[PDB]
Symmetry: C3
Subunit: 242 residues, 3 copies
């Protein structure tokens, strides 16, 4: 259902292997197991998330509907979606979501759960779950409001319209827009630049960043000063400070 390919050796690419369709509750639990093994793995430093093939990081907004169930099964299905999204967000290494095309619905939510999104020019993003009678279920209603603002979040969830990649850099949904034939190379170059950076400086920057967003400045500064301390008991600080 997937592949893992590490090379440097400190970076792997995780490729969602379902080109015939899309993220069900079967390729999501697989996504949980793959990102838990990278948490305990010490010889990868950043993670590149992309879709198999050349036309969709993930289109799970038109091509997978187990939605013929009762309301109670919706809670479990959403809980699976929150967990996989939470896993790929709070993973130890930085995540680069290489958007090679369609990233809609759940696919956008998984991509939004990543740290950095570099999209191909031939990429389409949005939250069309309102066309099927539901809100976003895997994390659209909150994460989308945090990366692009409350204004552009309401426009993209109420209408449910699909948008091109260029207007996503304009609204900040993606960080960089790069050609489809140059998406893998540019994502790797960014990955190599982060990989060359200190692991403990970056990984503990992520913890202070992924947690300082959920509190005031004062409490967030407490995590930073605790982040400041931990990287100091590490030879990485002293060795590179020359």
């Amino acid at each position: 259902h997937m592949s893992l390919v590490t090379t440097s050796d400190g970076i792997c690419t995780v490729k969602i292997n379902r080109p015939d369709k899309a993220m069900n509750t079967d390729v999501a639990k697989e996504l949980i197991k793959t990102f838990e093994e990278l948490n305990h793995n010490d010889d990868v430093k950043v993670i590149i998330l992309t879709g198999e093939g050349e036309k969709a990081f993930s289109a799970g907004a038109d091509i997978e509907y187990m939605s013929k169930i009762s309301a109670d099964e919706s809670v479990e299905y959403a809980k699976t979606g929150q967990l996989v999204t939470a896993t790929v967000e709070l993973v130890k290494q930085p995540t680069i979501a290489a958007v090679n095309g369609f990233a809609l619905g759940g696919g956008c939510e998984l991509a939004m759960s990543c740290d950095i999104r570099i999209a191909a020019d031939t990429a389409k993003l949005g939250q069309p779950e309102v066309t099927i009678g539901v809100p976003p279920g895997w994390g659209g209603t909150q994460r989308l409001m945090r990366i692009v603002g409350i204004a552009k979040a309401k426009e993209l969830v109420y209408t449910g319209k699909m948008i091109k990649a260029e207007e996503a850099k304009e609204i900040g949904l993606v960080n960089h827009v790069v050609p489809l034939a140059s998406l893998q190379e540019e994502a790797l170059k960014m990955a190599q630049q982060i990989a060359g950076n200190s692991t403990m400086g970056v990984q503990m920057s992520k913890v202070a960043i992924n947690k300082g967003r959920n509190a005031d400045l004062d409490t967030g500064l407490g995590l930073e000063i605790l982040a400041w301390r931990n990287c100091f008991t590490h030879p990485d600080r002293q060795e590179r400070m020359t």
Copy 2:
């Protein structure tokens, strides 16, 4: 005093208009009170799916900056002047259906604060916005200090309030104060065109994202994610999901 028209595909879209072009559609005490009743105090009727808010006359949305200098009484009562503005901005903000604020020209003081309470702001190319309250001696007391920084950030909000200037529409879209900017002649159609797109989608799935968004903006990720999972299950208890 104010005008409402309910007309769309089987009457789903309502266009609410402030009626005071004589004084640039200013917002005094009565205009706040009358508008709050129009939004029915945080609910509406089932017929309306999308709300469109825009000042009548095509000249201004609400230029209540220079034309209402009535703040000359009893700083005790200034609490109830801000409370009334706080209530009107909450009622527009927390109304059941999405609000499309099609600004047409001037939006200053409380008028800019009224627009920021809405969900989506589509701008005319002749529109200008700002919070000139500081030039008088007061901050924006209708949510202008709080709402403004949550839509454009801390750098642009602080710059806008401190100087108290007026920004043209293209720089409002640049910082995100307005979602879209369209020619004034073609404004009401484009504002309408987005409304039928929102109304065409399932109504309950629209107003449940709104609850999860308007309430998830005021909490950490964990609490906000727990609100989404409740509206998501709420939307599976209704035929719109299956059909």
Copy 3:
């Protein structure tokens, strides 16, 4: 280590420069503690209406991220961060607005000082970054928090993780700097802007400052409680009527 000139129309704009031209205005424990005295620990004199912070030499605001003379005693940096968290707390919470006319290099400790200011007006040569991770540590004086609350989580993560160095053209593209103006016209542009706020009501602007600076850390309802309390006070103050 400092230079404090105060002259304007109504004589209320105080120009504050970092005085260390030979070291690119680097940030050590000696210049950090003075800027706290320069800002008198969350107050000022009643004459000053507006504060402008820039760097001496017109070539570096503060290149204090790339002063790496602290490689010892993980305990003796808790305070180094506490020192760096105290200038930011004093510069950000000073009574009158802070306008950072950054002039050239402003990185990390210099950059996080700029993030403490309300307004940043850069120049073509003004270029910013947070290369702390390339050193082996996260930002310590508020970089992991103030950058996110300005440019959003997506671009802060890109800046903090890579620790790379961006121009002013894209610094205004992401909201890191409010305005960009030629290298011959920073101080004049900073002055005219600083005049524009100085000509407004003194109680109106600083009580907005308290309403926004404390309101960005609470929910909307509590933030409105901040504004209503400050709003009533201005009515008691004579500037509201005349």
